[PDB]
Amino acid sequence: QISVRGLAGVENVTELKKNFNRHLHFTLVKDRNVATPRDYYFALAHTVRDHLVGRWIRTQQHYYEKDPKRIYYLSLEFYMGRTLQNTMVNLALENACDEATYQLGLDMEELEEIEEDAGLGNGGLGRLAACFLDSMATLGLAAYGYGIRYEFGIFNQKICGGWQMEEADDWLRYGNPWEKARPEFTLPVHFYGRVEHTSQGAKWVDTQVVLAMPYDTPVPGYRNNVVNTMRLWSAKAPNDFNLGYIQAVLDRNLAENISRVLYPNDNFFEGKELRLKQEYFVVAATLQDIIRRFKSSTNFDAFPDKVAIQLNDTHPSLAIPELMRVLVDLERLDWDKAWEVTVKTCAYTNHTVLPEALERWPVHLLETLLPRHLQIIYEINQRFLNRVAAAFPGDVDRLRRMSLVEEGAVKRINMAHLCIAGSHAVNGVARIHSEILKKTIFKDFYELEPHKFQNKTNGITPRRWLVLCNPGLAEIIAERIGEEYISDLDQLRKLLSYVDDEAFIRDVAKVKQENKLKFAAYLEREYKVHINPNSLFDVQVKRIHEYKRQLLNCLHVITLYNRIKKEPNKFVVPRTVMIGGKAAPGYHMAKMIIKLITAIGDVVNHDPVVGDRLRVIFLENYRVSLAEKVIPAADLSEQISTAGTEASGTGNMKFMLNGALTIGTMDGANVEMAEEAGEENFFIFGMRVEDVDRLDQRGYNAQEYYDRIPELRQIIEQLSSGFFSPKQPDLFKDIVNMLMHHDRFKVFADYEEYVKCQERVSALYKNPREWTRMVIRNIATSGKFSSDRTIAQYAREIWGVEPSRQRLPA
Amino acid sequence: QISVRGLAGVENVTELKKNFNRHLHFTLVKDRNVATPRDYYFALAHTVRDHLVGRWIRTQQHYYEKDPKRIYYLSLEFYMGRTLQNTMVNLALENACDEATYQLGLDMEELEEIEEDAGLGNGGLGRLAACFLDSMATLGLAAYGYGIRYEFGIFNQKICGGWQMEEADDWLRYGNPWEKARPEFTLPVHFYGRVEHTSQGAKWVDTQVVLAMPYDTPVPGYRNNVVNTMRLWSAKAPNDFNLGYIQAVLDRNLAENISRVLYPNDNFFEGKELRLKQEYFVVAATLQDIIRRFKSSTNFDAFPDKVAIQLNDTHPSLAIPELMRVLVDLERLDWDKAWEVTVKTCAYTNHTVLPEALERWPVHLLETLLPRHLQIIYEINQRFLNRVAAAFPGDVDRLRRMSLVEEGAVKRINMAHLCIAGSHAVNGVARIHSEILKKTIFKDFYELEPHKFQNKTNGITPRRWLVLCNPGLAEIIAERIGEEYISDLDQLRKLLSYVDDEAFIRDVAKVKQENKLKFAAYLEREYKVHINPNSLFDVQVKRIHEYKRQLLNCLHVITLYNRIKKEPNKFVVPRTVMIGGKAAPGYHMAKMIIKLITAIGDVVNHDPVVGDRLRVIFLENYRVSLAEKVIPAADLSEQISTAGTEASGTGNMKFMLNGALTIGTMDGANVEMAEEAGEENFFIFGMRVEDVDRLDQRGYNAQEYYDRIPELRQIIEQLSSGFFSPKQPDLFKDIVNMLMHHDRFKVFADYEEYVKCQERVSALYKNPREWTRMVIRNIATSGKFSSDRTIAQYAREIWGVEPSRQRLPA
Numbered sequence A, B: 001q002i003s004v005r006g007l008a009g010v011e012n013v014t015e016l017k018k019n020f021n022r023h024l025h026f027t028l029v030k031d032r033n034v035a036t037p038r039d040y041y042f043a044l045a046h047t048v049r050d051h052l053v054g055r056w057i058r059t060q061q062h063y064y065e066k067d068p069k070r071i072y073y074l075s076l077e078f079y080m081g082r083t084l085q086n087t088m089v090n091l092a093l094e095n096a097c098d099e100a101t102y103q104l105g106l107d108m109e110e111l112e113e114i115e116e117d118a119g120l121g122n123g124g125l126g127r128l129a130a131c132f133l134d135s136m137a138t139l140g141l142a143a144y145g146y147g148i149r150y151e152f153g154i155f156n157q158k159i160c161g162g163w164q165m166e167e168a169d170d171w172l173r174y175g176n177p178w179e180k181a182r183p184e185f186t187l188p189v190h191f192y193g194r195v196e197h198t199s200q201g202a203k204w205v206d207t208q209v210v211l212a213m214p215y216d217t218p219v220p221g222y223r224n225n226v227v228n229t230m231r232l233w234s235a236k237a238p239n240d241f242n243l244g245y246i247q248a249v250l251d252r253n254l255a256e257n258i259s260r261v262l263y264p265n266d267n268f269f270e271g272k273e274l275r276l277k278q279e280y281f282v283v284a285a286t287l288q289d290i291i292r293r294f295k296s297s298t299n300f301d302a303f304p305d306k307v308a309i310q311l312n313d314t315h316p317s318l319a320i321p322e323l324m325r326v327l328v329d330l331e332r333l334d335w336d337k338a339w340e341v342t343v344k345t346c347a348y349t350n351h352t353v354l355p356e357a358l359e360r361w362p363v364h365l366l367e368t369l370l371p372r373h374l375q376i377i378y379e380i381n382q383r384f385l386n387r388v389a390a391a392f393p394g395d396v397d398r399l400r401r402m403s404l405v406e407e408g409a410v411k412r413i414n415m416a417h418l419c420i421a422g423s424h425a426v427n428g429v430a431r432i433h434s435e436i437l438k439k440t441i442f443k444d445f446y447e448l449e450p451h452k453f454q455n456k457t458n459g460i461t462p463r464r465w466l467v468l469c470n471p472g473l474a475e476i477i478a479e480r481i482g483e484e485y486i487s488d489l490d491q492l493r494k495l496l497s498y499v500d501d502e503a504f505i506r507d508v509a510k511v512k513q514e515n516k517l518k519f520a521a522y523l524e525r526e527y528k529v530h531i532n533p534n535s536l537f538d539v540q541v542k543r544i545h546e547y548k549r550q551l552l553n554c555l556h557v558i559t560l561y562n563r564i565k566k567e568p569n570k571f572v573v574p575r576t577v578m579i580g581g582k583a584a585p586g587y588h589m590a591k592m593i594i595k596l597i598t599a600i601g602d603v604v605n606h607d608p609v610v611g612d613r614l615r616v617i618f619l620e621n622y623r624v625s626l627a628e629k630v631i632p633a634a635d636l637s638e639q640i641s642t643a644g645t646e647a648s649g650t651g652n653m654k655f656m657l658n659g660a661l662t663i664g665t666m667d668g669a670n671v672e673m674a675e676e677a678g679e680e681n682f683f684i685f686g687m688r689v690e691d692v693d694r695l696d697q698r699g700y701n702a703q704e705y706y707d708r709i710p711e712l713r714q715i716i717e718q719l720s721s722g723f724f725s726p727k728q729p730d731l732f733k734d735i736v737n738m739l740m741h742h743d744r745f746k747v748f749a750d751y752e753e754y755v756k757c758q759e760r761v762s763a764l765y766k767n768p769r770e771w772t773r774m775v776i777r778n779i780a781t782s783g784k785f786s787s788d789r790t791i792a793q794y795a796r797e798i799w800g801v802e803p804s805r806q807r808l809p810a
């Protein structure tokens, strides 16, 4: 149908059809009389998987022959979403499969909707991992994603009476056709035990063994015939485990619990033993694999020339002492040589500002679980603090602040400190964030080793986040400037010469309108709710957190509502306000915010005076596949974190690419986005970082704003008095109380400037042509925010490898 | 190579080869450079599975169209063993696959050895289930095996220092290519809750739900293109289960424990809740499936014309009250009509003599777990005892003895009593056993309803147990009388006209010698032990139990040893004595017997005076696949249970078919075996049932035998004094003590007659020609012991269906 989706050759279509029927019969053991849509999805999935296989085998073969330097991306999270469409896009099979399925009398779109999200992540960090794998494959890097195959991913969110309920994401129930179990590459991982000191150095003995069984998933690059591997480990008990009889067999589940469930805390740290077991499990199994592969090329001097290990935050920080343990205790390298190898191998990406999100493991935990690793950590600390002392003689305070070991009631290891010490490169994930690392939280580490600190501004893959989710926009772009932009997104800048082209303006607005119609219809069928598709689609989708200030959004929504009620017969630009996201199960306040959103909806959406001028919708179960639908439908992207709290953000980039204007603070990558588009093409409001600091010094008194802003006082009185909760008038006292006395994120401070800025948005929306021109200026300057740019910077400036757009043979 | 293995057409071989390479590439994602024998096994397995698929789909289609009466074989055990060779035999693909693999440079036999046994059974009962499925498919019956997909089957037996160690049978580790998960046919099963009585009858409420997910495995008939289904249920938690967050997800394992592990008690009853959950789980899921299928043909009068349910012992006895519960509580039939339907649908096979093996469930267990089923059981009991009272007025004692409810400290339900009451047919598993049911343990039930009691003497499938495990013997038989005997084993009787044919005598002895050479070699490589292949192979393989009197065998072995030591320079027929089997993990005495066997081996096998004249070998990890190797190699089959204790036995039949002579008691099917062959062609010894009764009346005094038999006294003194346990002289005091004071199975009573009979065996073995002639007379009369005969009797005399040898189209 559309060009970017590839050719549908007669031969290709015929071949896909016959392979689809072969899999239905032989693979699924169904005839056409009893097959369900789900059988058809599986038959198609198996058919597309077959086109990966040749390329996967040849790619891995190629890496054995050429023996390039290998990149190991260690993450506890890969937020992959669905695989079927992504595979079709990257192998140029989408039109052929559409055609082949059409002729079988099936609708491919309906079959795509049957696929489960692989939800093995919480949000931004997990998704960044997924976007990176895509870009690494597209840039022909010999890269491997390593993580955990959780049996249960991020929970499915149900709303009951306006409250979040969690239910288990049983994503493997029907089988995963994309993974290949490799039970033959199973590896032992050790826990507990104790350290014996002998003549021949330290020995780790009397350990409990858990096996790590790898599952490999193909990662296809964009039309380059490259297929990289994502290897995820699953925990399995050894067969002698506990070995009255019956109970011993049932107790195998204790070991296998390690890979059972993803911890659902976005940007918070819980010091749980099971979480630490997950961290070591992935590190220990991965390092053995890395070393095995390296030895099939006694001399570890070349190790860093053949191996890069990237740590996705501190979650796999144990890679540093584990690498030391293997090199020192097993390979019998001296300490200094092993340390050299380790530093030159490892690099650490920080994704964290908020101190409560930083991993600080109690020493008693590490002592019991990983006795040898704790010894190695103490040794690292001593040698590190010896260098600090020599460089800064007499600065005893610096020594305290820089220690890997935090003193206190409980001693803790600061895993971030361990990562900086043991890595040749430390980066943040947007320029402002990287600067903040150098100026505040790692100021001391920066002064000792300035050379280590880099920036790598985040990005998103334009495959999933444009071509896949928004084919209509991809196509009208491709009509003017060709297809090359999909693997070279800077080419979108050529669209600035179409900003006054009437036809292009018409087409950009048409695509947006079509996406909105399609999303409105989706809301009706799947969730029995009606919305005006001619309204401005104001969407804030992201995990529910105080720093992201969904509450600020709520305050705006109630303001619009109170303004309509005061002057019912005055024109206002209609809006559909859509807020979506999951709260961490133990985060009370996040759960109250969801409840407040739905309570506002309950009042606003049933007020007859409001009409269809204002609708508030909570989007249930926000996940990757819902993001692919709602982001192409959005007009206004809400990126309204308190300045200094969002390290980067990546949602922001998704919306920029997909033809929404941004209302945001100068936070994270918002800063670079506004710089690329021009500040005049961006709705900036609120305190800068500098302003937040000024407020903190003299002290934040919310009362002052309540006293000076009547519109805000009204809202707070409504909340307090039960306007939004008639049956339980005090339901939201925790929210009021926090806003008035304990608001770390200064919601009131940005309120006035936000509401004013929101008025400027409405004004521009009244002028479709000028709205769409500003949209074009955004899309056209979004090139920097491709993960291809990001990975190319990682490769040249950290990993020491050159990317390539050259194709492997087919 | 050999004719019974089928044709190797040029086309067939070429096609198998290309499909093997296709699966290696696309299914396994391997090239030939990195593939292991295990990858080759899987490629072959997937290639053979493909030939089942067409036939499986067409067979199930046929049953929908023709709508024949359906047979449901409910068992907690299916001891299937390996599937690959069996599939090849039944589809006539064995020579073609041999040829195809040969040309790929692989050895098919080596690939067969990589397949795991499906060990979802303990021994005789589980294997009977497997043999039956084979015969049901071969006889074209619309039959379904229903059971539990245990994650862990019967444990792997290791011997350490002569002691049994158990380790977990992780049979699914590498995947099961033979099963098809059917997650779309998942069904809820209920536990706990309580009963509400309303206007509209009883309601079972506030239950815990476990889901039952079916896995289907194909069961091919012998060259008739019929493929039946074995459906096994796996337990899965619902997604709202327990739904702090993390722990709720981890607690899902409590529900899934139901299908985790097979209980390893052969012929013993443990009243464990988890075992009762397994029993209900398989019953509840199966009955829903049965009813669903029946409704796709409100009127249950035809239910018994369309459904037969066979209960494999009492393990699925809850099918009776469950069927009543569904019909009465859900379908709203009146009690009497529902009861009629139930009785006419259900039939019960008893496999049990020993009272400690009979299932007697505490009422408090059923009360908590299955409140409604207990109500229905009490109601069944009342109405049943009302009929007893009317037929036998005043016989209050009979009422007590026949009650489904046993009075005592703990009240118990006698599940056997429930099965007789609720079934139209009750059978034992050999003639002597069926008579004993009528004369002793169910005498009362027989007098009330004589029409219900039948015999169905057990059998073994000649596919696995001749063609598959002993191709050389199959072939020389086929040379003379053709191939038809494989599906009509009575034709073996034609071999009696070859008993004086010199060439046939030569060939039978040659095959035996080749099997022995091959098995001797197997012992050397896999277990570093050497044996004389010219010795008589005396084998006793079966689960370790007191009633099977492995100890009697031990007494014979020590007798031979003491006789050699007394007269070292006298000729004795050389013997390799091989004893194998598993003990239940909590059965102390069975574990001591294994230890004694290995301790005798430790003395006998290292005595230089003995030479290679006597060797004692404990065969480790006896299982179906080891039985396929050792049974064709055997000369003497040891079937030496105390008269009245072995319900049937089936090992006995396997050896008869495979050219071993039998030494046995008149127990179980031994009686019918001797009647078929002629008593002169069988080594019968020991007490009959009548003799055991006579001994019990006056009392069994072991001392008397010890006092009168010097040879036996010597053995007991050796055991006591530490001759067989020098470092621990009192190691075997429990064994001595039991033999002398607490022997329920009267080992000493049969000792003299056993040893004498063993001398007659040795004498005949000195005369090869006459030994082989007697072997021929055994093989030739083994036809009755085909499971095809057995199933044909079940079908005509219980299920009311006619078997068929007519082929479905290919």
Ligand SMILES: O=C1NC(c2cccc3ccccc23)=N[C@@]12O[C@H](CO)[C@@H](O)[C@H](O)[C@H]2O
Residues within 6 Å of the ligand: A122, A123, A124, A125, A126, A128, A265, A266, A267, A268, A351, A352, A357, A358, A429, A458, A646, A647, A648, A649, A650, A668
């Ligand atoms: O989305 C994120 N979660 C965590 C994060 C920070 C700290 C601890 C965690 C623990 C688990 C999961 C995620 C985290 N960090 C985040 O990383 C993204 C990728 O660079 C950034 O765009 C976000 O601005 C940042 O908030």
Ligand SMILES: O=C1NC(c2cccc3ccccc23)=N[C@@]12O[C@H](CO)[C@@H](O)[C@H](O)[C@H]2O
Residues within 6 Å of the ligand: B122, B123, B124, B125, B126, B128, B265, B266, B267, B268, B351, B352, B357, B358, B429, B458, B646, B647, B648, B649, B650, B668
């Ligand atoms: O092998 C068997 N196990 C049990 C058995 C009896 C009682 C309780 C059980 C519980 C679990 C497993 C098996 C049993 N019964 C047996 O059934 C076989 C098939 O008819 C007979 O040939 C055996 O003579 C008999 O011993």
Ligand SMILES: *Cc1c(COP(=O)(O)O)cnc(C)c1O
Residues within 6 Å of the ligand: A122, A123, A124, A125, A127, A541, A542, A543, A622, A623, A624, A625, A627, A648, A649, A650, A651, A652, A654
């Ligand atoms: C991109 C993405 C995120 C990250 O969004 P932010 O707005 O940067 O927090 C979270 N969740 C999903 C499902 C995404 O696709």
Ligand SMILES: *Cc1c(COP(=O)(O)O)cnc(C)c1O
Residues within 6 Å of the ligand: B122, B123, B124, B125, B127, B541, B542, B543, B622, B623, B624, B625, B627, B648, B649, B650, B651, B652, B654
């Ligand atoms: C046939 C068989 C049995 C039953 O043997 P008996 O001697 O009748 O107890 C037990 N186990 C296996 C592995 C078998 O093949």
